[PDB]
Amino acid sequence: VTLFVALYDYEAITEDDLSFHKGEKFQILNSSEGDWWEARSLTTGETGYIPSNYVAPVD
């Protein structure tokens, strides 16, 4: 799949969110018309929701 990269730091708002650091990489697990996607971090291996505007596709 296409991997994604964090444009900014994100501190979890909800208990289901993934926290992450700028530059962190992600597999995107689910991505709807959400403001929120669900992803898994490649640095911590943690899973949870992220803001879809905080990430960009890696190429």
UniProtKB/Swiss-Prot annotation:
It comes from the Eukaryota. Residues 1-59 form the SH3 domain. Coiled coil: none annotated. Phosphorylated at tyrosine residues, which can be enhanced by NTN1. Palmitoylated. Isoform 1 is highly expressed in the brain. Isoform 2 is expressed in cells of hemopoietic lineages, especially T-lymphocytes. Interacts (via its SH3 domain) with PIK3R1 and PRMT8. Interacts with FYB1, PAG1, and SH2D1A. Interacts with CD79A (tyrosine-phosphorylated form); the interaction increases FYN activity. Interacts (via SH2 domain) with CSF1R (tyrosine phosphorylated). Interacts with TOM1L1 (phosphorylated form). Interacts with KDR (tyrosine phosphorylated). Interacts (via SH3 domain) with KLHL2 (via N-terminus). Interacts with SH2D1A and SLAMF1. Interacts with ITCH; the interaction phosphorylates ITCH and negatively regulates its activity. Interacts with FASLG. Interacts with RUNX3. Interacts with KIT. (Microbial infection) Interacts (via its SH3 domain) with hepatitis E virus/HEV protein ORF3. Belongs to the protein kinase superfamily. Tyr protein kinase family. SRC subfamily. Non-receptor tyrosine-protein kinase that plays a role in many biological processes including regulation of cell growth and survival, cell adhesion, integrin-mediated signaling, cytoskeletal remodeling, cell motility, immune response and axon guidance. Inactive FYN is phosphorylated on its C-terminal tail within the catalytic domain. Following activation by PKA, the protein subsequently associates with PTK2/FAK1, allowing PTK2/FAK1 phosphorylation, activation and targeting to focal adhesions. This is Tyrosine-protein kinase Fyn. It comes from Homo sapiens (Human). The gene is FYN.
